[PDB]
Amino acid sequence: EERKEKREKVRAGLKRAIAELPAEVAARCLALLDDASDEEFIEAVLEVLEAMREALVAMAREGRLDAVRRATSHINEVLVDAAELALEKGREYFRRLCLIVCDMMIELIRLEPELRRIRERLEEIRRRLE
Amino acid sequence: PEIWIAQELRRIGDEFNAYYAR
């Protein structure tokens, strides 16, 4: 039963994250989230996550370092429940999240001027999963 | 098992948002 609970919590944090995006991408991520039934959900989450990773890196090179922060924080508050659900449907669904989320933050860290410690752990967690 | 990596990712991810730009 708790699958539905964790799905609404992932639906909530991702919505709050998407609200920090431009309206062009905030439309597709929002339609993919709400037109995916209940078993493509994790696929839509990984789709919305891949579009978000695509979005936040462009704004990070622009100077929108505050929107990327506010957006990723909402990605963070649902990162554990998304991995648990993705692990419930398949070990590959777990691994897809890091390759999105881990790769997202890594490029976000590799863009901001002036911690390599976090970049370091993110790379190995990617390697250890690969 | 794998759930630890998830908790490690929020931990690492929450630290990224803390000490990002400023």
Numbering used by the authors:
A (entry chain A): 2 to 115, 120 to 135
B (entry chain B): 142 to 163
Q: What wording appears in the published article?
A:
Peptide hormones, such as parathyroid hormone (PTH), neuropeptide Y (NPY), glucagon (GCG) and secretin (SCT), which adopt α-helical structures on binding their receptors, play key roles in human biology and are well-established biomarkers in clinical care and biomedical research. We set out to develop general methods for designing proteins that bind peptides in helical conformations. We show that by extending RFdiffusion8 to enable binder design to flexible targets, and to refining input structure models by successive noising and denoising (partial diffusion), picomolar-affinity binders can be generated to helical peptide targets by either refining designs generated with other methods, or completely de novo starting from random noise distributions without any subsequent experimental optimization. The deep learning methods largely converged on the overall solution to the helical peptide-binding design problem—groove-shaped scaffolds with helices lining the binding site—that the human designers chose in the initial Rosetta parametric approaches.
Inspired by this success at optimizing binders with RFdiffusion, we next tested its ability to design binders completely de novo through unconditional binder design. For Bim, 25/96 of the designs bound by yeast surface display, and FP on the highest-affinity design indicated a Kd of < 500 pM (bottom). Circular dichroism temperature melts indicate that both binders are stable at 95 °C. We solved the X-ray crystal structure of the Bim binder, and found that it closely matched the design model (3.0 Å resolution, 0.57 Å RMSD). A kinked helix on the binder adjacent to the interface is well recapitulated in the structure, and a cross-interface hydrogen-bond network designed between Thr73 and Asn77 of the binder and Asn20 of Bim forms in the otherwise hydrophobic interface. To our knowledge, the Bim- and PTH-binding proteins diffused starting from random noise are the highest-affinity binders to any target (protein, peptide or small molecule) achieved directly by computational design with no experimental optimization.
